[PDB]
């Protein structure tokens, strides 16, 4: 007991600055462009994006493959010559900026970029402008770097969202002022295609833009597609070009204020935030064409609309969470959604169906008896659930040989796991007298399944989200894709054959996680893969064997292009009184004396579409909890019920009880590690979680007090009612729905049940999070004062929902090492 | 050793118990009315505003002053209510947003009616109420009441909030109100109301506002109106209304967060910071004509026959305005930019004209105007430090080509003085129509004389609220001032005929805050001292009618009476001769030879003073309970406070943050010297706003001296805060980058303490004053130097903590902190 019990040394302030200060003291977004020519040494040339060592940006870069090799380091050729993408000082313009915390890009530089492979044109943002360069096809390959070429304009303010043309990359397009443009690269014309943008609250109608909500909560951050080839409609011989776009109208959505980053100038910047029960915008799908001539010309633009309104056709419709066209452009696609969250539909827009825009009844009328009886909406596909639809990426229609469609596609619901199936939907036209109204029954146009054919099976998931995709090989019949079949753990490369769905072959080697791209040819393949023990490297394998058996190419190593006082920490697993498996994670104490007990962190996140808890190298994001084990501190990670990787029965636990199942889950885990492994002082346990995990800390500190002596809530969410649509009622349902469980796990509700001691809880907030508002800890804050509660409290002034600014980082880490060292006893 | 007196640790439901357990208005706004009836007992009503210990909320209220009082027995009088069972704070005590930012700037606490207007012949009361206006009668023509009466609601087609009323002085019918930033006037008898600007529109896009005070103009020039009626009518009838018209087009706009935290919306403010564009300003005249009937004819818009820019070119703020009594002139009180030269100017009704877009229009009415009429400049006050705004301006009536006038200055010798002056208005003769260029001293009246009614080393009080009271058939005139000493107000009377004897009508040993019967036969002082809590007391003047500035006062009748340890005023001199006053709690049950922790209380900015012999218990209950624990607490009011005079004051300009530490760090050490309980090892510096701004100075420069710093609402960048009070002490930033920098506590956040638990801060997030930035920006940049803090927000809180639960939470964080890091 006396001797038994690690005391933590005690560091003056500037002693644990010098701790933080030392402890802190990859290629991605692949090409494969194969080379025609026999007589060189080169295979392929690898372009991608990635961050040299000594550089201090993202940049594109490439590596030349050689056709044989005799251990192989690929060389990091630069692409750009001497080019500064960032912005000066790294300030980025007000969309750009929120882009890059809509997809949490912590790097600085060029974070995408579009590529066009026949022509060898690439297109990018950079310097908060546009930008273009040329190499391989007809350009031919470059040895040394060349400048990039910025693309002049007449429009004002951010090009939000460069897309070359797939049909003629002579053309491309562009978002300004909440519009779509459309421009030609060769010949400098721009032209404006969408008018719904003119002054601020007073101006609610956008074109071709992704929402808050559906940037953050469906992960789609785009609402035009450009159709993939060209008409030759017309009197006299002009090519058309088709852009399928989402139209906005947010006129009814509440307007909620952030503070700006410019803080002297002491403003905040107005936003359309639907918080749950509330108003989501009013949206629409319409169609964009423009007419081209021979020399390249832009002769005429359109705006074309659905014949009938798509309120009226598609009555149920919430969101649009993806969409794209078949690719010989015979019909348009959209993923659709109700606003539970439990019924998607994959539908077909003809082009037909679309007829042009105008103010006048008369017109109207006469474009829509225009329209073909038999053209319609087909609704190929349909997923339903009690629980509620994950959107899923994948979605492959193979090209039609009349009457009927096949398409690739991932579902969940069926089984509870996500797994590809083949489906054929029959398409027959109902005959539809457009110009007369029309009210859609149940299953109005609702495809007959011809045949639907399991293709993966199993207690294990195809990956199908955040950026996780499928390759599929029309020649030889096979699908590659992602998954964890071997482990929940890891990452693999499987492949698979469609035609035939017999033997899934793991093309990935085990003890590691993957993160794969294939080459569009399927001669060779990369993966950037790592394990808990060892950092990450980034290898090139080629697929090699006979041509007569191609599910059984055997991986064989090609090349690499990366390789390699922390101390990693070791999964493991146990079982709950229920008897459902969980998975953890525990950092030793370093140089830890056995019979010593040991104050702990259990940090936690705990929150829908994240798992901590896989066999993939912490180091880099969680460097923070190996200091921590430097010092002393027993760190436990528990991915508890809820978490994703384990399909929709186990994410299903959250359902209209957030707050209710995880602690359980983490105090059972914590109790786990304490019989298991000898050094944990359950008397000394701090619970320690950003934005849901600072929930779950404050949950933990309310439900479970004699557990946790503290809590370090990092932008935590209080009050359910004030989080959006999109993620709150896809697991917490309505406010008036689930008046009981937005109560039980609202934080801020529960604060008489806050400790009466203080220094066992601080609370972290970004003052610029537009995320989760700073309201959310002011709140707590109010309500602390009003039941008498202590707290102490820090503001991160130049902040967002992450502390991306390293000086901010420091303070941080710093705060909780005091924080922990005074007051964990 | 065990000399250190250490303070007993309580864990936190301890110090909530002891918070709880010490917290377990007086009448104002008098208005004297003589009762004519000599068969009666009483000789006077008093009307006043107050707040009973039962009720809830402040009220209109009366007394009964009788023909005679035993004098034996200490008569108390009853507090008899006008209103019958009236609630005049709104649902929940939520005002509307203009009404609510008119009780932040009035630093208004208390719920209920907080103004009201008195006509005195009609015996007319009027006042806001529940969000509107209201209306009763009592006195003169309607008669005297027994009973309380219902106040009758004031109909109105006006849709938001009617600001501002006041009855029209020449016709009790009538009066007058703002409702959206634009002056409207109406007929209480009749319910008829007409709008008579058209400013405001239907809030960036539309800046111009007419009978509007600004922010600036409200915060700090003590100014909550921009239009003054015309005390007379001219012959149907004309009633007349001066008015400031604004433009606030070229004025920042800044967001500030919404008291509905659940909406996470902002209000805009056109806050003019310091350097940056103040408004451009005007005074307007509005003319209606009103028949026999009552009803408004015919309403203009008149404005001066040549631009305010053109005959003003110097003049940035309005301070005051309003008319003289016969209605003969307007005058208004300008200043420049700087803050250094002020100009009574009066304005003849002549001199405007009626607005019109059409230029032959303009041009008839322009020659038409008299060549002999014009502005009169006959006042001018200039210095080398600052001026000052000080209420008092008395014109007498014009017993034509003259005016007399009392008028308080304190730039001429140091000290604020009345000075009887005689103007000669003499007219230069002036083509109106043809436009042209003022130079310096243009229109400056040449002085006839200038006589000094008072002088030496004291000041009269003219600011925040005081003012004289002149009585023009004994040539007498009633002020109150610091000539006893700067720790006391007193009630001063002296004859503006001769200046000779000044009489001190309240008795010495305490602080007073008197009231005058505008008869001149009694008066009321609301009173008290360090040692004893407050009372307002009845007092008759008098004596002999041939000899009226020795009326003696003899108290006639009281309204008011009254583990708690007063503290102890001090003094002491500086190392360069400068005798600073200081105020000591000493702890509760000391032992001597014990050395205990000690509070130095701070505020320390211009405009106040916090050091002198009046009540403190009320208002500074806190620094009791911290001596009830054994904290000693210390305040110095140090060079820059008020009541001291200019040179005094002076001290802060152009270097704010330099000189009052040192002043605080003498009074400290000599305090250790003096009493024998102060431990110097032990000392916290605690401040709010300015005393914030202090705290942190504390720290920064004397970190051997002061052990922790409790930092309230602080100023941390001078460059952030207004243009009206920064200019005026601290010049603009162009001008004074040394001065603006080094009193930027911001600025040199390297300086603070790299130990933790040394400073905790705390801000209102709802402050419209000292906006959280301040805070916001202390913090980004005591993470930029990598240094430690404590933070407490405030989400339902503007500059002061208004709420109760609030105010326990912030004093029991108070004394933990100082319990656990002291
Ligand atoms: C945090 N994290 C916030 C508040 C709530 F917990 C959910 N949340 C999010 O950031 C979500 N928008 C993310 C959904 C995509 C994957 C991570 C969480
Ligand atoms: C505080 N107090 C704030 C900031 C700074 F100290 C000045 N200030 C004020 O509120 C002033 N505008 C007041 C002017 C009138 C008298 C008290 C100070």
Known sequence: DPAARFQVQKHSWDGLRSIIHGSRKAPHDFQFVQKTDESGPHSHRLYYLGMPYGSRENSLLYSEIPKKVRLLLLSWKQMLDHFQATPHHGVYSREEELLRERKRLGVFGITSYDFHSESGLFLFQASNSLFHCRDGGKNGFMVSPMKPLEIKTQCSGPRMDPKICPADPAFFSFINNSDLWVANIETGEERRLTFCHQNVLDDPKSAGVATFVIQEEFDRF?????????????????????????????????????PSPALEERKTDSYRYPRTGSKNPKIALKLAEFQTDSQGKIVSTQEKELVQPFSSLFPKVEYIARAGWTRDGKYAWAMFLDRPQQWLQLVLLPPALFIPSTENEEQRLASARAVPRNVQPYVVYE??????????????????????????????????????????????????????????????????????????????????????????????????????????????????????????????????????????????????????????????????????????????????????????????????????????????????????????????????????????????????????????????????????????????????????????????????????????????????????????????????????????????????????????????????????????????????????????????????????????????????????????????????????????????EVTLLHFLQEYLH
């Not at 088709?242 to 009814?252: A, G, K, T």
């Open 383 to 812: 997923e339903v659930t009690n629980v509620w639809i994950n959107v899923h990426d994948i979605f492959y229609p193979f090209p039609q040989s009349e009457d009927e469609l096949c398409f690739l596609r991932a579902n969940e619901c069926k089984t509870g796991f996500c797994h590809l199936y083949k489906v054929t939907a029959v398409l027959k036209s109902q005959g539809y007298d457009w110009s007369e109204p029309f009210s859609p029954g149940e299953d109005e146009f609702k495809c007959p399944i011809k045949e639907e054919i399991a293709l993966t099976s199993g207690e294990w998931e195809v990956l199908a989200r955040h950026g996780s995709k499928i390759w599929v090989n029309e020649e030889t019949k096979l699908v590659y894709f992602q998954g964890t079949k071997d482990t929940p753990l890891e990452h693999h490369l499987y492949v698979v054959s469609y035609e035939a769905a017999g033997e899934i072959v793991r093309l990935t080697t085990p003890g590691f996680s993957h993160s794969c791209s294939m080459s569009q040819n399927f001669d060779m393949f990369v993966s950037h893969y790592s394990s808990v023990s060892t950092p990450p490297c980034v290898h090139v394998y080629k697929l090699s064997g006979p041509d007569d058996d191609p599910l059984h190419k055997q991986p064989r190593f090609w090349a690499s292009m990366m390789e390699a006082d922390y101390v990693p920490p070791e999964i493991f697993h146990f079982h709950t009184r229920s008897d459902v498996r969980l998975y953890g994670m525990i950092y030793k104490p370093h140089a830890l004396q056995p019979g010593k007990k040991h104050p702990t962190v259990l940090f936690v996140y705990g929150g829908p579409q994240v798992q901590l808890v896989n066999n993939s190298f912490k180091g880099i994001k969680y460097l923070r909890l190996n200091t921590l084990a430097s010092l002393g501190y027993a760190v436990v990670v528990i991915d508890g019920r809820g978490s994703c990787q384990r399909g929709l029965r186990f994410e299903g636990a959250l359902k209209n009880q957030m707050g209710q199942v995880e602690i359980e889950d983490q105090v059972e885990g914590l109790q786990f590690v304490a019989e298991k492994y000898g050094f944990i002082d359950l008397s000394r346990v701090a619970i320690h979680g950003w934005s849901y995990g600072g929930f779950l800390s404050l949950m933990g500190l309310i439900h479970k007090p004699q557990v946790f002596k503290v809590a370090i809530a990092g932008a935590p969410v209080t009050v359910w009612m004030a989080y959006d649509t999109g993620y709150t009622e896809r697991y917490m349902d309505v406010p008036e729905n689930n008046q009981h469980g937005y109560e039980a796990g609202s934080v801020a509700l529960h604060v008489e049940k806050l400790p009466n001691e203080p220094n066992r809880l601080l609370i972290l907030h970004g003052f610029l999070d537009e995320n989760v508002h700073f309201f959310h800890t002011n709140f707590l804050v109010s309500q602390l004062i009003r039941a008498g509660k202590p707290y102490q409290l820090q503001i991160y002034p130049n902040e967002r929902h992450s502390i991306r600014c390293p000086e901010s980082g420091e303070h941080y």
């Open 222 to 258: 785009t609402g035009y597609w450009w159709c993939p080839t060209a008409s030759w409609e017309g009197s006299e011989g002009l090519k058309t070009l088709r852009i399928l776009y989402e139209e906005v109208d947010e006129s009814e959505v509440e307007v909620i204020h952030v």
